[PDB]
Amino acid sequence: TYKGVYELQTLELNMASLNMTMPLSCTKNNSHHYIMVGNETGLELTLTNTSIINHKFCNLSDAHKRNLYDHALMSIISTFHLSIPNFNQYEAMSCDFNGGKISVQYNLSHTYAVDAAKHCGTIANGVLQTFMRMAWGGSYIALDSGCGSWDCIMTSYQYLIIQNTTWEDHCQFSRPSPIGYLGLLSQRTRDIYIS
Amino acid sequence: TYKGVYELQTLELNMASLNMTMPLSCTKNNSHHYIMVGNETGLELTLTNTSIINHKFCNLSDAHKRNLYDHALMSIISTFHLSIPNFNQYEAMSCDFNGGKISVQYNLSHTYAVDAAKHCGTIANGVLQTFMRMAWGGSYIALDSGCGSWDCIMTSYQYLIIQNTTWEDHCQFSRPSPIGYLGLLSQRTRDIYIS
Amino acid sequence: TYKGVYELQTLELNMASLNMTMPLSCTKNNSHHYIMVGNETGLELTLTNTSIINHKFCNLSDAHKRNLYDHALMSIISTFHLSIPNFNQYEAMSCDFNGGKISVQYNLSHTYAVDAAKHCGTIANGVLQTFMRMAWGGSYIALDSGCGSWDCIMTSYQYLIIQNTTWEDHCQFSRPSPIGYLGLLSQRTRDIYIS
Amino acid sequence: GTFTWTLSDSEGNETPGGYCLTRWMLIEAELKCFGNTAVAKCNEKHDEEFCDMLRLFDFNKQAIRRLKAPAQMSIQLINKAVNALINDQLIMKNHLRDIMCIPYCNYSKYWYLNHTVTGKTSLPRCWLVSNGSYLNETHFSDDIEQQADNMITELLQKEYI
Amino acid sequence: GTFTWTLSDSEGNETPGGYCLTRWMLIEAELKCFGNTAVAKCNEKHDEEFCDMLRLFDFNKQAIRRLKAPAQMSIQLINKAVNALINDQLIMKNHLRDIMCIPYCNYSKYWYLNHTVTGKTSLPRCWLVSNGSYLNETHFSDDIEQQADNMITELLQKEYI
Amino acid sequence: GTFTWTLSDSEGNETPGGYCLTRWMLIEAELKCFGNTAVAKCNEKHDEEFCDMLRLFDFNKQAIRRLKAPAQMSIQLINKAVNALINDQLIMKNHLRDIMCIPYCNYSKYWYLNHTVTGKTSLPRCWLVSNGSYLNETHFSDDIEQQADNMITELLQKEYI
Ligand SMILES: *[C@@H]1O[C@H](CO)[C@@H](O[C@@H]2O[C@H](CO)[C@@H](O[C@@H]3O[C@H](CO[C@H]4O[C@H](CO)[C@@H](O)[C@H](O)[C@@H]4O)[C@@H](O)[C@H](O[C@H]4O[C@H](CO)[C@@H](O)[C@H](O)[C@@H]4O)[C@@H]3O)[C@H](O)[C@H]2NC(C)=O)[C@H](O)[C@H]1NC(C)=O
Ligand SMILES: *[C@@H]1O[C@H](CO)[C@@H](O[C@@H]2O[C@H](CO)[C@@H](O[C@@H]3O[C@H](CO[C@H]4O[C@H](CO)[C@@H](O)[C@H](O)[C@@H]4O)[C@@H](O)[C@H](O[C@H]4O[C@H](CO)[C@@H](O)[C@H](O)[C@@H]4O)[C@@H]3O)[C@H](O)[C@H]2NC(C)=O)[C@H](O)[C@H]1NC(C)=O
Ligand SMILES: *[C@@H]1O[C@H](CO)[C@@H](O[C@@H]2O[C@H](CO)[C@@H](O[C@@H]3O[C@H](CO[C@H]4O[C@H](CO)[C@@H](O)[C@H](O)[C@@H]4O)[C@@H](O)[C@H](O[C@H]4O[C@H](CO)[C@@H](O)[C@H](O)[C@@H]4O)[C@@H]3O)[C@H](O)[C@H]2NC(C)=O)[C@H](O)[C@H]1NC(C)=O
Ligand SMILES: *[C@@H]1O[C@H](CO)[C@@H](O[C@@H]2O[C@H](CO)[C@@H](O[C@@H]3O[C@H](CO)[C@@H](O)[C@H](O)[C@@H]3O)[C@H](O)[C@H]2NC(C)=O)[C@H](O)[C@H]1NC(C)=O
Ligand SMILES: *[C@@H]1O[C@H](CO)[C@@H](O[C@@H]2O[C@H](CO)[C@@H](O[C@@H]3O[C@H](CO)[C@@H](O)[C@H](O)[C@@H]3O)[C@H](O)[C@H]2NC(C)=O)[C@H](O)[C@H]1NC(C)=O
Ligand SMILES: *[C@@H]1O[C@H](CO)[C@@H](O[C@@H]2O[C@H](CO)[C@@H](O[C@@H]3O[C@H](CO)[C@@H](O)[C@H](O)[C@@H]3O)[C@H](O)[C@H]2NC(C)=O)[C@H](O)[C@H]1NC(C)=O
Ligand SMILES: *[C@@H]1O[C@H](CO)[C@@H](O[C@@H]2O[C@H](CO)[C@@H](O)[C@H](O)[C@H]2NC(C)=O)[C@H](O)[C@H]1NC(C)=O
Ligand SMILES: *[C@@H]1O[C@H](CO)[C@@H](O[C@@H]2O[C@H](CO)[C@@H](O)[C@H](O)[C@H]2NC(C)=O)[C@H](O)[C@H]1NC(C)=O
Ligand SMILES: *[C@@H]1O[C@H](CO)[C@@H](O[C@@H]2O[C@H](CO)[C@@H](O)[C@H](O)[C@H]2NC(C)=O)[C@H](O)[C@H]1NC(C)=O
Ligand SMILES: *[C@@H]1O[C@H](CO)[C@@H](O[C@@H]2O[C@H](CO)[C@@H](O)[C@H](O)[C@H]2NC(C)=O)[C@H](O)[C@H]1NC(C)=O
Ligand SMILES: *[C@@H]1O[C@H](CO)[C@@H](O[C@@H]2O[C@H](CO)[C@@H](O)[C@H](O)[C@H]2NC(C)=O)[C@H](O)[C@H]1NC(C)=O
Ligand SMILES: *[C@@H]1O[C@H](CO)[C@@H](O[C@@H]2O[C@H](CO)[C@@H](O)[C@H](O)[C@H]2NC(C)=O)[C@H](O)[C@H]1NC(C)=O
Ligand SMILES: *[C@@H]1O[C@H](CO)[C@@H](O[C@@H]2O[C@H](CO)[C@@H](O)[C@H](O)[C@H]2NC(C)=O)[C@H](O)[C@H]1NC(C)=O
Ligand SMILES: *[C@@H]1O[C@H](CO)[C@@H](O[C@@H]2O[C@H](CO)[C@@H](O)[C@H](O)[C@H]2NC(C)=O)[C@H](O)[C@H]1NC(C)=O
Ligand SMILES: *[C@@H]1O[C@H](CO)[C@@H](O[C@@H]2O[C@H](CO)[C@@H](O)[C@H](O)[C@H]2NC(C)=O)[C@H](O)[C@H]1NC(C)=O
Ligand SMILES: *[C@@H]1O[C@H](CO)[C@@H](O)[C@H](O)[C@H]1NC(C)=O
Ligand SMILES: *[C@@H]1O[C@H](CO)[C@@H](O)[C@H](O)[C@H]1NC(C)=O
Ligand SMILES: *[C@@H]1O[C@H](CO)[C@@H](O)[C@H](O)[C@H]1NC(C)=O
Ligand SMILES: *[C@@H]1O[C@H](CO)[C@@H](O)[C@H](O)[C@H]1NC(C)=O
Ligand SMILES: *[C@@H]1O[C@H](CO)[C@@H](O)[C@H](O)[C@H]1NC(C)=O
Ligand SMILES: *[C@@H]1O[C@H](CO)[C@@H](O)[C@H](O)[C@H]1NC(C)=O
């Protein structure tokens, strides 16, 4: 006890009970990360060496008109996309919204020696910093910069892939939490270099 | 009295005295709503079954260059337009700024059975939710959803029309109040589905 | 002393010690204003009657891809540009980013009798009001409107020129301060007329 | 004593006269005055709808006098002022209550307690509405009584304890 | 007595029962109750991670009951609510601490002091983490002891001074 | 005791040494120290220009030490920090006062009262300027005297009342 009579006690919150109102971020490992979106469904976010979309096309505006997707899942994805620092297209994103499915891929793999040398930009900086905000408590794939000393990071991965999935227990490395989404949602001021 | 000696008293503010600094929202009935903009002038906002603009054109950028309009009235209208959730053009708005007059019409009437089934989008969701924020204390034309249980609404009306008018007493259903405008003005974070 | 025993004392902060984290605004005279950006470098902002860029071109997006500039200097310039009230291009800005240099010029000189009569717009209003926010404590070139009674100002100057410079003592009329930049950075809500 | 919520320095609020609401602020009464002890709470408060209306009125007063013949409001002056003057979070809380069918402040009536022997009053709180009408005293009686107790404590802890 | 952080009027928080956290709020304990004296601090606080979680839980409770079968959350209801419900500045402070390798709140565990004779407890404060682990009691012992002193002062200043 | 406005945990502020401003924070004095009782007010304050400068200095201290050789500031680190560190509303209030010809804080000089027998000082408040010059003591004498009274109350209410 502290000062004779105070016992230190611990409270820990179960944020899974918030799943009907807020999306909840989770982590499974160094690559897989998750967002619970509904009671049964959510998004899977992965970091890989393998491209699954070989398209250089997205045609997002046609996908939107097609309107065969869950608006909640789409809303979260577009939240992510438009929260990217130094937002622009830079090509970068290819997608597939045929039917009602969702598959979105970012070309982090863009990085080559000249842009690697610049570090603080060229698509990967903005995508990775958004990923890290969605993923609070996730795996800090900043590697040698894992505790965040520096704010420009690079990863070994080539692609960030976001897909519509089934909610199953994952959350092996972190507690479900609304903070990631809320962070991205509230941080809407100015964060660009080019416009 | 409360606890023997406290008399409960009522204070009510006259917000019309704020008309030289802030625009003031008002309501007349289920359709007509108003904004006082100046000492003598303001905007009339109506919900109707009759189109007054048969144009599929707005040419807002040419109207802006023409520059024959009151900047204050225009500023309020563009505040409204750019505050629309899921902002995009989607055609949606037609206008007439010939001479110094203002007439702006939104195609809420777009709604047909497929989009009606979707509810949470397709132009009307975004326009109606902006209208309801401008109109605090106005007529809650959400109808069966009048107290706002649910956040996706539909109305019987086909068009939202905004026009330059003369300030006359209206304000039959509500107190003049700066809150509507201030609400729209301060709520500038993120509210989209498509971008 | 106050109330017998309280001596009034003065504290004044040396904000130059903040130069490694925040850009610092300064003023030299009625025209020259400065931003310290790094330990050795910064931006010079001037108000002149002489154009140095005779181009009607900027090609900012090509400059960005060229990527021979200091991202910090560019970030501050684009902060300024995108903070302009009633933001649009309106032509207005011409630039030169050949090599790694920075030279940006705004056509305040646009003003002629019709637009001068309107006052509250036509490029100069937005550029000048951004300049004044970057320049807290700077020279209030609002002239007869120097204390800011009114919020639409005009200056005698024709061009606002921003260039990459060497930090040398300047700061003759003001204390280095992060407030100007911070003001522009945090003020990100809504401030347009046209969109 | 002085206030932090006014824009004007000293002129915005004097200590000895307390703080008064004039006939152009109020609808039915010609005059209502509050002690600075209660009004001063808006110096600190991050809540209370009344305090935003109070700031908007101070702004209007200064804006008119400073900009002689403000003519047509410029809109841009107020837009900057809004970010400086009001609690945006609070408007959004009342917006949330309006939606979801929860009693909420529509910024019209406010209520306060007034002692029947002395002149002490509380800071006004927003009278809430629901389904187009004002709530009865019996629905918000918990807050009315809590306010009475708060006033009693302040009256009792006078000069020293 | 009553709370200002709830959306619901009176129903959101009653005075005599104090404020309780149920089995769906907590992970291991079935029930934890705090006195309103401590919980009420969230009525005023512009800080404390615990108070944002507390507001999000109140929101979830009302949102579910009001929108019968919320089915798939609409997202837009919560986005508006977020601006009304949480301290964005606070999330950003913890974000800054996460970056730059400074112990920060990851919104999981909270700690509080509980008197061993009486039932008095403090408002919970976030247990911080660094390098993937929770900090030891010896690293934040200054705050634990300060909290104990704050509780002692409140226990001593009972009714009158 | 401890502070809530620092980013650093405990190291940011120790209790027994009070809180000091070094020669690189101040322009003319080599050293000025304030008691934690007054500095700690920034733990709670939603106002006082001094508290934002105080937070920016803490940020600068940590940012430099954490990012060894910050070289050229990245800008993006500070932009995120700004949302976490400063009162934006307060800058906008001073902006409004600058415009409309109202005395306003230009974040340079601050003033405080210092007791001539004991070492007690107040938290500094911004010295305002108008028309390019600092205001005289006679224009803001109401606040100087109010501050003196506030300090007197604190000195008198020592240990118990
Ligand atoms: C704030 O930071 C804290 C840091 O502690 C996060 O809290 C949790 O921390 C623990 C580590 O102390 C995380 O890991 C857990 O380990 C338990 C034991 O691991 C052994 O057994 C597993 C078998 O699968 C081996 O792989 C491992 O190497 C060890 O030998 C596991 O039992 C935990 O749960 C697992 O099993 C259950 C089923 O019984 C599954 O449902 C789980 O998904 C998981 O597979 C767990 O792996 C722990 O993950 C951290 N999170 C949680 C939720 O407990 C806080 O989460 C963080 N805050 C936020 C918001 O993220
Ligand atoms: C917060 O919510 C409250 C809810 O009460 C709004 O406050 C006002 O509430 C009253 C209802 O109690 C509104 O209606 C008023 O009714 C009065 C009596 O109505 C009879 O007579 C009229 C004759 O025209 C009939 O149509 C009606 O059916 C009844 O038989 C009217 O006298 C009121 O004013 C009318 O006449 C005057 C001229 O004397 C005109 O200037 C008015 O514009 C109007 O025509 C009124 O109609 C009342 O409208 C609500 N508002 C106001 C301003 O009083 C609060 O307004 C709301 N807060 C905000 C910010 O909106
Ligand atoms: C908030 O508002 C205050 C207003 O007072 C600003 O504070 C400073 O105010 C003084 C005026 O009181 C500014 O001017 C200073 O004048 C000193 C004396 O001037 C005589 O000598 C010069 C010779 O160059 C003549 O030109 C002049 O006409 C007078 O005859 C100068 O000594 C000051 O410094 C100069 O010399 C030093 C080298 O010794 C250089 O390093 C300086 O850059 C400069 O050339 C100065 O000119 C003063 O500029 C105001 N600022 C500062 C930093 O002191 C606050 O700055 C303002 N707050 C903010 C954030 O801006
Ligand atoms: C997602 O959030 C919802 C809402 O918080 C969680 O649903 C809730 O589940 C609990 C049980 O775990 C329900 O509590 C009650 O349990 C008793 C028996 O123990 C039962 O008799 C009651 O009828 C009730 O079921 C609670 O009512 C229920 N809330 C609602 C409105 O659904 C859900 O479990 C969360 N999802 C996950 C994966 O945690
Ligand atoms: C729009 O706002 C303005 C400013 O609040 C209101 O103008 C004000 O009107 C009042 C009278 O109603 C003026 O008060 C004074 O009245 C006495 C006589 O009673 C007179 O002697 C004074 O000269 C003065 O007129 C007040 O000064 C005036 N303010 C200004 C600067 O114009 C206006 O009434 C509001 N509009 C509406 C529709 O309510
Ligand atoms: C820009 O900001 C940096 C950081 O605040 C300032 O650098 C600092 O300079 C001071 C000296 O003025 C250093 O203090 C120390 O001085 C003693 C001797 O007096 C020396 O023995 C120590 O080694 C140290 O140099 C301080 O450490 C240093 N901080 C760092 C990390 O560089 C810089 O002066 C500011 N620029 C301008 C133009 O003011
Ligand atoms: C870490 O994540 C990877 C995926 O990036 C896991 O490997 C595959 O995961 C999928 C989806 O669950 C399975 O269908 C595959 O069968 C897995 N691959 C293999 C070879 O089994 C990997 O197992 C995860 N690992 C941990 C926690 O060690
Ligand atoms: C985006 O649109 C292009 C349009 O060219 C699609 O590419 C295919 O183009 C050929 C003609 O060269 C058509 O016959 C195919 O039917 C088009 N495919 C599709 C799916 O429409 C491209 O595939 C589209 N990409 C996405 C993600 O929709
Ligand atoms: C495939 O995965 C590896 C990791 O297993 C990625 O890592 C890079 O590997 C190359 C070759 O050894 C090194 O030069 C890089 O420095 C590594 N990257 C980092 C951040 O350390 C590799 O990038 C992935 N993709 C490809 C196309 O090789
Ligand atoms: C409710 O608003 C409608 C308009 O949408 C009113 O009907 C017309 O209003 C205009 C403008 O004031 C008049 O010029 C027309 O003459 C009105 N129509 C008719 C047939 O008289 C309607 O009167 C309003 N009603 C209320 C409060 O009952
Ligand atoms: C927007 O621009 C179109 C341009 O075609 C306008 O339509 C008319 O086009 C015919 C030629 O086909 C011209 O002779 C008319 O003079 C044009 N009308 C006008 C008003 O310019 C359309 O009307 C314009 N719409 C708006 C709202 O300005
Ligand atoms: C014309 O006004 C009526 C209301 O008087 C609008 O209301 C719709 O009417 C149809 C036909 O009875 C119903 O099927 C719809 O369900 C009603 N809408 C709602 C929201 O309940 C009608 O939309 C208006 N316009 C047109 C072109 O009919
Ligand atoms: C005020 O600023 C102007 C520049 O706009 C100064 O004039 C020139 O400044 C440049 C840059 O330092 C020098 O290279 C030129 O030689 C200066 N011109 C002349 C004729 O000497 C001007 O000196 C500044 N003045 C003050 C404080 O009086
Ligand atoms: C923006 O691009 C135009 C492209 O026309 C540049 O103008 C020159 O155009 C002639 C052909 O008419 C070429 O031979 C020159 O090489 C172009 N100049 C340059 C620098 O590319 C214009 O100068 C460019 N402006 C900027 C600021 O880059
Ligand atoms: C050149 O500098 C002068 C100032 O020295 C600028 O000032 C204008 O001068 C004209 C002619 O006397 C006046 O009619 C304007 O009213 C002055 N402007 C203001 C705001 O008072 C002049 O604009 C500059 N440029 C040019 C091309 O003349
Ligand atoms: C994504 O949604 C589509 C809807 O047509 C479904 O067929 C597909 O299986 C879903 N994807 C996953 C991984 O469950
Ligand atoms: C709108 O402004 C024009 C200015 O040319 C005027 O002629 C017209 O009558 C105004 N409209 C209304 C409804 O008063
Ligand atoms: C701007 O940067 C370029 C880099 O190529 C340099 O040559 C030029 O001298 C710099 N401009 C100034 C005014 O120092
Ligand atoms: C409260 O109830 C009484 C009794 O029915 C009624 O007379 C009074 O008008 C009501 N007041 C309000 C504000 O509802
Ligand atoms: C604190 O240190 C003790 C002794 O090494 C250890 O047993 C205990 O688990 C540690 N607790 C935490 C939270 O680090
Ligand atoms: C205040 O007035 C006195 C007397 O005129 C003068 O000496 C002093 O310098 C003035 N101080 C300020 C800050 O204006």
Residue numbers in the entry:
A (entry chain B), B (entry chain A), C (entry chain C): 60 to 254
D (entry chain a), E (entry chain b), F (entry chain c): 259 to 419
Manuscript text:
The LASV glycoprotein complex (GPC) mediates viral entry and is the sole target for neutralizing antibodies. In its mature, native form, GPC is a trimer of heterotrimers comprised of the receptor-engaging subunit GP1; the transmembrane-spanning subunit GP2, which contains the GPC’s fusion peptide at its N terminus; and the stable signal peptide (SSP), which remains non-covalently complexed near the membrane-proximal region of GP2 post-cleavage. We present the development and characterization of prefusion-stabilized, trimeric GPCs of LASV lineages II, V, and VII, revealing structural conservation despite sequence diversity.
We focus on LASV lineages of public health concern including lineage II, one of the most common lineages that circulates widely in southern Nigeria; lineage V, which circulates in Mali and has decreased pathogenicity compared with lineage IV; and lineage VII, a newly described lineage isolated from a nosocomial infection in Togo with comparable pathogenicity to lineage IV. The resulting soluble constructs feature sequences of circulating lineages II (LII; strain NIG08-A41), V (LV; strain Soromba-R), and VII (LVII; strain Togo/2016/7082). LII, LV, and LVII each have an additional PNGS at residue N271 or N272, though this site is uniformly unoccupied. Similarly, when comparing the GPCs of diverse lineages, we observe high structural homology. Using the prototypical LIV GPC as reference, we note RMSDs for pruned and all sequence-aligned pair as follows: 0.78 and 1.9 (LII), 0.85 and 2.0 (LV), and 0.73 and 2.4 Å (LVII). This observed heterogeneity is derived from areas in the EM map of poorer local resolution, insinuating greater flexibility of the residues in these regions. Consequently, these differences may not represent physiologically important conformational epitopes for LII, LV, and LVII GPCs. We observed neutralization of viruses pseudotyped with GPCs from LII, LIII, and LIV by both 12.1F and 19.7E, consistent with the binding data.
